[PDB]
Every structure is written in C-alpha cells, then in structure tokens.
C-alpha cells in the first residue's frame, strides 16, 4: 500500500549550500555540493517501523537500516558518525535527532515526510539552518 517505500528524485533544493557552510565545508566545494546535489535520488523500503534508505548521487552512494524507536549509527551531512534516533510526529512524519561520537559541533537532526499530494520533502538542520528538499516518485 502507498507509504513511504519507493524510488524518489528530487525536484527542489533550498538552502543547501548555507547548511555546508555550517558545517564549515569551504566555498569551492560548497559549490561542487550544490551541483551534485540535483542528482539525489532515494529509494526507500518501508515495512511497519523499519526503514531501508538509499541515498545516492551520481558518485556517491549511502544506505541506512533503522526501526523508529531504536538508536542506530549514521553519518551527518558532513559526514562525521553520529548516534541517531528516529520518531514519528505523525501518520507521515518522522524526525530524527543526531548526538556525534567523537567531538563538539553543530546540533544536527532531519526529517522525512509524506505530503498529501505525494511527495517526499526531506528537512537537515544545523543549528539555527534549515535546508529543505523535495522529492517526487521515479
């Protein structure tokens, strides 16, 4: 039945490059980011509380295993390991928070969601930024 799981590529993209910069990714590849950026595609296998997640791009590709609930390992957007935890805010939402490691830095979290009209807007926050991305069936 229609839920999260599918083949998604994104439309839309804002605020990217300001997270990076957060995150004290210098401006050249901020840049590079921006641009590889337009090709993320998901794929999203979804049973009950348990998600199978694949984000690529064109050269880069990550999976995540989580069941909501239950703490699990992941990468930030910059790509320092973190402890990650995943729940529900509604029928279509769920938000995770991100504890690091190793290390100090910025207070990082995402979000998921299923809107009505059926796309999948995806949020990743570094402190006071917010970046937005929207995503539409293959």
């Known amino acids: 039945m229609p839920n999260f799981s599918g083949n998604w590529k994104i439309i ?15 401006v050249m590849l901020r840049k590079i980011a921006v641009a590889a950026a337009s090709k993320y595609a998901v794929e999203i ?12 791009t064109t050269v880069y590709t990550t999976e995540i295993n989580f069941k ?33 490691l190793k290390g100090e830095g910025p207070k990082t979290s995402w979000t998921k969601e299923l809107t009505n009209d059926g796309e999948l807007i995806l949020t990743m926050t570094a402190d006071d930024v917010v970046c937005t991305q929207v995503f539409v069936r293959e």
């Open 12 to 26: 839309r993209s804002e605020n990217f490059e300001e997270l990076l910069k957060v995150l004290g990714v210098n």
């Open 45 to 56: 296998k979804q049973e009950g509380d348990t998600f199978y997640i694949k984000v690529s």
């Open 68 to 100: 909501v609930g239950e703490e699990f390992e992941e990468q930030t957007v910059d790509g320092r390991p973190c402890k990650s935890l995943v729940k529900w805010e509604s029928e279509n939402k769920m938000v995770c928070e991100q504890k690091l």
